[PDB]
A paper describes a structure:
A central domain (CD, aa 380–515) catalyzing the phosphoryl group transfer from ATP to pyruvate–or from PEP to AMP–via a phospho-histidine intermediate mediates a catalytic cross-talk between the distant substrate binding domains. Distinct conformational states resolved in crystal structures from maize and the non-plant organisms Clostridium symbiosum and Trypanosoma brucei suggest that the phosphoryl group transfer in the catalytic cycle is accompanied by a large swiveling motion of the CD from a position next to the NBD to a position facing the PBD (~110° and 45 Å).
Hence, compared to the two extreme conformations of the CD next to the NBD or PBD previously resolved, the CD in the F. pringlei conformational intermediate shows about 50% of the rotational and translational movement of the proposed complete swiveling motion. Remarkably, in this structure the CD is positioned in an intermediate state between the NBD and PBD, thereby enlarging the solvent accessibility of the PEP binding pocket. The entire domain is rather mobile resulting in higher B-factors in this region. Concerning the substrate and cofactor binding site, density is visible for both ligands, PEP and 2'-Br-dAppNHp. Additional density in the conformational intermediate was observed in close proximity of the phosphoryl group of the PEP substrate. This additional density might reflect an alternative position of the PEP substrate in the PBD. Both interactions may restrict rotational freedom of the CD in this state, promoting the stepped motion of the CD.
Author numbering:
A (entry chain A), B (entry chain A): 0 to 486, 489 to 874
Amino acid sequence: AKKRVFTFGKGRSEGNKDMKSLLGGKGANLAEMASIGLSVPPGLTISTEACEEYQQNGKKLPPGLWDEILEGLRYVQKEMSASLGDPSKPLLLSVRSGAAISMPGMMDTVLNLGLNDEVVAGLAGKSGARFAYDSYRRFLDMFGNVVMGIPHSLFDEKLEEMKAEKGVHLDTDLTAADLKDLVEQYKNVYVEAKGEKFPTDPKKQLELAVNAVFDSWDSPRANKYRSINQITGLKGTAVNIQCMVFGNMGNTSGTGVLFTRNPSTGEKKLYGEFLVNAQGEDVVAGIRTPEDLATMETCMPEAYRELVENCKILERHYKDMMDIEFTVQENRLWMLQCRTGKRTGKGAVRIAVDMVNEGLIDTRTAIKRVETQHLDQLLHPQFENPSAYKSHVVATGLPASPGAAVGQVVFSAEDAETWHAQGKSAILVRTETSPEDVGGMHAAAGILTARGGMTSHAAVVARGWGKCCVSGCADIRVNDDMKVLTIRVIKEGDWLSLNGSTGEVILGKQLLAPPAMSNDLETFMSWADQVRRLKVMANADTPNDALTARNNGAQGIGLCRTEHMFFASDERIKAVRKMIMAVTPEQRKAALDLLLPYQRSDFEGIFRAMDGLPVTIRLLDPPLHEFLPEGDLEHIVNELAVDTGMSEDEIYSKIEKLSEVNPMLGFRGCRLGISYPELTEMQVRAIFQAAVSMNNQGVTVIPEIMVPLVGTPQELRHQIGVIRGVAANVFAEMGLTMDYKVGTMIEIPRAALIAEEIAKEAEFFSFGTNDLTQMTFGYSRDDVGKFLQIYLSQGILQHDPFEVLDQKGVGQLIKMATEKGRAANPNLKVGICGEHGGEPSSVAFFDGVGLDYVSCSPFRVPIARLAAAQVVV
Amino acid sequence: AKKRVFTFGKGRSEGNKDMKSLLGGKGANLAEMASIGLSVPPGLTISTEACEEYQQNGKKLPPGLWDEILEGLRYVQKEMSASLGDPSKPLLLSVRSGAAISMPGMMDTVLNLGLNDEVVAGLAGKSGARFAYDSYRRFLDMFGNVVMGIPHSLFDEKLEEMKAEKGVHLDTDLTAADLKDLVEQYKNVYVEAKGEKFPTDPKKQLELAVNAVFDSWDSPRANKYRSINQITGLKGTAVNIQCMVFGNMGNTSGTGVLFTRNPSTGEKKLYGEFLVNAQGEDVVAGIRTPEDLATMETCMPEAYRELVENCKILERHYKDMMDIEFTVQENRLWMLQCRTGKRTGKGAVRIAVDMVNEGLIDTRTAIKRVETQHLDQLLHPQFENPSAYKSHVVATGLPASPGAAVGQVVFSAEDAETWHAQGKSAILVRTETSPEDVGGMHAAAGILTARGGMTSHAAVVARGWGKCCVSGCADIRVNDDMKVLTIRVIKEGDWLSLNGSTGEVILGKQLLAPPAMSNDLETFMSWADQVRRLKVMANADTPNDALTARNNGAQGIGLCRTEHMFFASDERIKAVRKMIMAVTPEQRKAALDLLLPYQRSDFEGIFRAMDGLPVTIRLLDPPLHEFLPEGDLEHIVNELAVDTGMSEDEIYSKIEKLSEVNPMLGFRGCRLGISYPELTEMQVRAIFQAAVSMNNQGVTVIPEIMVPLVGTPQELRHQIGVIRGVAANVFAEMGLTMDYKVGTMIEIPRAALIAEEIAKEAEFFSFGTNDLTQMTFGYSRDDVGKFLQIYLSQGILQHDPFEVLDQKGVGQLIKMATEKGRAANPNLKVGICGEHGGEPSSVAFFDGVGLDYVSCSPFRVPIARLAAAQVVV
Ligand SMILES: Nc1ncnc2c1ncn2[C@@H]1O[C@H](COP(=O)(O)OP(=O)(O)NP(=O)(O)O)[C@@H](O)[C@H]1Br
Ligand SMILES: Nc1ncnc2c1ncn2[C@@H]1O[C@H](COP(=O)(O)OP(=O)(O)NP(=O)(O)O)[C@@H](O)[C@H]1Br
Ligand SMILES: [Mg+2]
Ligand SMILES: [Mg+2]
């Protein structure tokens, strides 16, 4: 004889939390909450072994299981002083299915089992007559559907028949008298559709419900899942029978919700609402207004104390802030639902640190209690009072890109571009978005799309900028031609507020505060930095940018793109354009002399800004089409002659000879430095000259030179030869030798496939996962937009591979180069400077393969630091 | 006591061929030729162990080695009836160094050791006085240089002093009296530069020479090599001392050369020349004209018989045709040099098959006796009589691309393009060549470059077309402006003949014969096909092309590029252009209906032409920029409206929306079929409709559908879904189900890295090594020309990676996908259709990794068949 029924009640549980296998997911959870002393209404759980015996007994209850169940019902009846079927003191039950793991095709929950004409009459004496009858029709529908196999549409048919006959649109506007008549119609659907009438004996209703739960396990919907997921070794589903409690049984009863701490600020104070003589539905429906918890304390003192004690137990056992749902039924507090409560970014760090000071959790735990998105909220503008506008929220979409923005609405990109140039903050609103308007999106303070998703074009480009965005908000329809949003006709030009962190879109101008520092945040990040394994460098090409990086925690610079160090002045581009068009090696060397001071000065500032940290400078890797002006080839070629002074026929044939079909795979990277050593000699001279000058002013310079787009060790060996030669010249000309390192980019697939050859020549690798992703997938980053959305929406891709690292494909090359590289050169250092360097899931993969550091934009360093810490916990 | 000197003579050898370790390379060879009974002048070899003992004895001859050497000299003296130093009957010796393997920095050969005033006087009595003195100065120079360490420039200084004083340019125009005076000047250089005079005792000269050979082994030039190549375990170099023989000692003596069979035709007849009373130098210098061997037989009968017997021994031992060098000295035949003789393509197969019929070699050996280039000669036009023009050859460069062409000279590409359109055969001659004129090179019948190489732009594009080319001919200087070749002022327009197989450039019109079949060739290739392991399919998009392939031995079609099946008619491109510009899915489907008949008809012809063989059709993979006309965007857009009838404003914005920055990585391959299933549905419909129609006419159809540019298994699964759906429609509409296969291209690196995922979905892989090479290296095939030559010439690359498979990089992905694919799908078939499919070294790599077949252009199938056979032997 084996036990198959396990009762649970406040402080008393026959099971335990570790028995997921026997009681199922929820059943073991109900035992857990009960054991720790939470006020859960009493009930019982029929084990999964019982379900198996039911199968092995021809889908008939096994021997003595029913007597075993009745024993448990008697326990529940005694704890509640109610009994099944008694109109004076009826026991109503919930029936829930649950396996050892999430499972589709399982039987749905059935509420208020134990109702019938007699019982419902009694219930109407404590609740409204409307509630009792509305609760009866719902049971008849759910029961007839979930348990008797009657399609839901048969009941709903008789419902819409009455609504149309009465002439009303909403269910809430059917009178209690109507619902009483509607009850009898539902009872007839049983006869019409099955020839068997609704069973009125609660015990009969329960037996049928127990069979249905076991039956649902062997359903086609269920078997179809378990076969797909290759999951063997499950006996069945458990049945969870629990007593129903109500908050509308009089003035001694009520329903409320709370977070054990404030979810916007993190204050260690209960935070919630409570409504006397009502149900949870009445709260969120808006039929009536709740009241702050304080009210409960002053009118239901004993119930409030038990609530306070319940909340203490929660945080003591779950070691975290909890979002709960409770109801007081005739002065007895009952715990219904609890779950870790959603927080704001600010509230996450506050609660994380407070619980550490409280000795409730350690720092390691705390580091995984603040999501990278939580931290992201703190790195961006924020709304002063998150809940002060709760009354003005008109819809809530997806939190595409965290942040907060406010501005006037405009329905096109060009006009969002017109409105920025005139001073104003623009909110771009379009049904969807495509690469055809990346410029207009770069002007708008915030973005909002009707059709979209976490991997939409709006969401991906927005996150790459840190720009606020709310994507995929089904509630909007956006008329480009008509210029109105119908969520309420929202005019073009009206002030709209967007919360990219909660997905909320809000009416009117809202108060905005800047990202500020706090002692909690400062303390939190210090924990992350101590536990961290990966160093976090920065991608900075400007002195001012290096400064911003170091302020954000950068431990150095892992990539200084030398091609992006000429956008500031026209004198700089006119200098660049002098070389691109150079044909005579005298004119080429002349243009390089014109460039030397610019490169040297910049490098000096960068070294000064990164005083005492590593600075990895990368040799040229130019986007030519970026350096040539807009217009006709008529308009464009005139400007080139206006800088260069080459003959107009000569400047023409040069653009001819410079254009490429595939520039991303063309004359770029080291292919330039090798074809034109003069170019590399100039750069390497500016570097060392700067290094010496700054060293002489007491600056600690730790320079690294880097060769881009290498696919062969011979390419790398070539540029190094050029470097070492220039190093001797500068160090001899200036009278100081300076220690440096020389390494390579690993952004070509061949470079990973033969990394062992390249490691014997290089002092460090850094993966350029932009090109490497482009080369591995054969996706042009400029042109990928022509099909990426079709792939994402059709399940071909799960993420924008240029944003989230492809671990199976791209990641295999990274894991390959690192292993081969370290095996061939134990002193090799390995890092990253592709965009994936700042992406959390990517960072975790990099710590996994044992990289030394990661590098990312200055604004992304903090997130990379937290990601680097979360992975080692 | 260990033996360190090993004599050799006709039929008598103390060593053997397998003693390379002790006698060195040449020493073991001299023992080999002697053992088999060849008429090699007698000599001896001082072992490599002797050299080691010399080192371990402070660079002094070890104990008794000298007595051991003198014993060997006595043998040589007795076999020749000459003795060192005897003016009446002098023994002259050659001293040669030789290790167990090729070795730089080793001592050079020294000839005519044993000369002095007395001996040289005697020698002048048998040769000319000029020869004796010219031979003396040469010994003094070589000996003083190689053995005494006197720089060669000191002797040559006194030589140019006399030439300038006498006033003559060439050495051949110094009288014997001059050379006699020049001898004494060389003897003084010994005193001036060393204070030690020339040693006159031949035995002293030999001892010094033996020391020099041993010394050279421990030279800096030598040690620098062995250290580079990580080659341990060599004791030293052997010394090879051999008797000198001369063919200018009177009318009983002479010098000749022969191939044991004809090198142009393969006839089993000796083929060579012979000159009485002369030296090899007199032959090739042109001072005197040789005579056919037949002459030797009739005036030196005994010497000729011994030659005939020597040649029989050669072919009997070496089992191959031999190119030899012999001299008769006073009626004794002496064998000097032998080596496998170079043949023509025609001569290779003739000799290969004849030796099989003779039972001299088996078929397996014969298959490796015909180089892929030999066969290539037979697949192209050829010169009627290779040696009839030997008198007209003006220079010989590198055999870039095998073949033969004749035409008038032109010094530019545009004018070679002007001359083809007017009917004539053009020979393009430029110093070098670049991608700027691939069109002009496509017109010229032959190509000739002054500066180039086997990996020049001329040679690579020429081989890709099968077009004749002779590259890197230093003897030309090519004045573009002046229009003359100075090799002789060659005018523009003059008839020039080019032999791309021998690198010979020839004066005037030459006779050309077409590639014909022979029983030898037909028999040879049947051997190759029996032994072959890989099947050889063809890349054919046209019925006529499929025919040409099957005539060349194609076992099927491994790649039918569907994008190249619309170049024939204007009605076809106007149909294509209808779809590219389609925006309305009604107009898109309309354009597809216009295309269906074309695709169906073509497929029908292809199936018919490949009746009973596999045909692998590949879904669309279009080069858009190829389908749009030349001119301004003004001129171009008018034509699009002239086909489409779209509004001129609408056709404008469409080109805008269709252009790409990197089309090779853009909207192509399966990304089209997935974005526009209509396109794939049309193609797959034309395929099956054709398949059924031809099947109904008794044609055996074995169709395979193929998805291009896949990087994910989801991409592949998508198109297959479209295929299987259309297959049902056609098979139901026409009332016949037909067996087919569906597979994928493996041309994206990610597809190889996760091949196991793609193999569970595909029935076969074929590596597209064009894109895969492009993706792996990050080389754009269109734009790579901007730096590929700089890489090749600087040692960064050893081959054009798009021509020769990169085995370390690209090959790793191929070896990876195949292993993973077969492990996940044992029924998977793997092939190739990139250009590397027809390249011999690549084919060997593919048989290595165990591929099922290769595929290549119709004209390249025979070479691929021979390559496929050579690898398994
Ligand atoms: N004994 C009760 N007294 C009162 N109200 C009750 C009682 N048991 C349930 N309910 C309510 O019935 C509804 C459905 O129950 P569930 O347990 O399915 O709830 P969820 O957690 O939202 N979905 P899940 O993923 O299936 O767990 C909820 O609103 C709960 Br609070
Ligand atoms: N005993 C001889 N009687 C006559 N002439 C002789 C004799 N020994 C040599 N020679 C010639 O001297 C020259 C140089 O001799 P080598 O053996 O070096 O010749 P190669 O094969 O061309 N180069 P290798 O790579 O070093 O072997 C050749 O022309 C030879 Br035939
Ligand atoms: Mg890069
Ligand atoms: Mg391809």
